[PDB]
Structure 1
Amino acid sequence: MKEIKLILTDIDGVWTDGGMFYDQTGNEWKKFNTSDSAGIFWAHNKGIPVGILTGEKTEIVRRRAEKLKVDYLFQGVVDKLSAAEELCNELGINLEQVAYIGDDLNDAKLLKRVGIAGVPASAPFYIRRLSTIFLEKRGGEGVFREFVEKVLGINLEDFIAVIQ
């Protein structure tokens, strides 16, 4: 499929089902899926970097990005298209060489500009229709992994090669 040099991803509604847990004390949680770490694995296996673009800003996400050895983390991003363009500048690539997955309004402008756009099955219809590949999985169900595997054309042969 289309050649990709950078994989970018939103968090809420992609790495999660959109859930934001609040308690009585000011603490907050997100629920990640260990399945998604394999998306980082396949990307790094093919020598492709992964960056997170999120509108939120939390220690939750910083620690998760650390655990998964994500290459870039941008939090509190107000303009994701600008952020992506700037990062493309740094790497000497075009948006045409980027695969991005997001699920909501703040992702729309960037989704429309990238080489491959992914949107989970759980997303609003007017975002889902921006997706250029079909994703079966919902947010939090391992849809980041699904996206990476499809974008990179990971097949049974690739699997067999890594489990020797």
Structure 2
Amino acid sequence: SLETETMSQDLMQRGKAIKLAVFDVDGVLTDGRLYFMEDGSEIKTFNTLDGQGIKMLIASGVTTAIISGRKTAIVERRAKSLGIEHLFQGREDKLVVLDKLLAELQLGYEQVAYLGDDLPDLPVIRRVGLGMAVANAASFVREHAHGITRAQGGEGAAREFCELILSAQGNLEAAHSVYLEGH
């Protein structure tokens, strides 16, 4: 993309050490809309481009996680399908959850990328190696992030984030060559 080709020196550098990529759900994997039916059940919407991006990222050896303040079986099903290894729902204390996971995984903050959209993501965004916000994240989150995606949440922002990491790590060309003969 033009985003991976014009990726800043800073984001390219920050992408090098990444071993773990973490996503919030609402506003990142979705457009931030919450659909409710009369019985109180929810409908959730995700984006076709993001699944492909996450799959390519995982294939490159980067493990993935979701930390969400909300909880629904829709997300559990979505994550399992994609191959996301670590899912934490119903947690607004995102930093507490992250710390426990990094201790288990033996990783430092610099080895973590995170893509968020609102205030509860901020304590994590400020501390990780690659802390990014989607294009329509709360402006206060955008101002304190290392980078912002061109795409909006739920419209390929996760895909863009995945490709930034792949590109930073020298792995995007190989991922593309699976699909383009003589690339």
Q: Equivalent residue for 1:21?
A: 35
Aligned counterparts, 1:88-107, within 5 A = 88-107=102-121
**Equivalent pairs: percent with the same residue?**
43
TM-score, structure 1 length as denominator?
0.94
Aligned counterparts, 1:63-82, within 5 A = 63-82=77-96
SS in 2 for 1:67: helix
Q: Does 2:139 align with 1:161? A: no
Which 4+ stretches in 1 moved above 4 angstroms? none
Matched positions, count: 164
CA gap of 1:152–1:97, structure 2 versus 1, over 3 A, is same
Equivalent of 2:25, from 11, 17, 30?
11
Distance 2:176 2:60 in 1: 15
List alignment gaps of at least 5 residues for structure 1.
Answer: none
TM-score, structure 2 length as denominator?
0.84
Say if 2:142 and 2:148, in contact at 8 Å, map to a contact too.
no
Equivalent of 2:148, from 117, 120, 134?
134
Cα displacement (A) at 1:155: 7.0
Tell me whether 4-13 or 64-73 shows the greater mean CA deviation: 64-73
Distance 1:55 1:8 in 2: 14
Equivalent of 2:66, from 40, 46, 52?
52
Cα displacement (A) at 1:66: 1.6
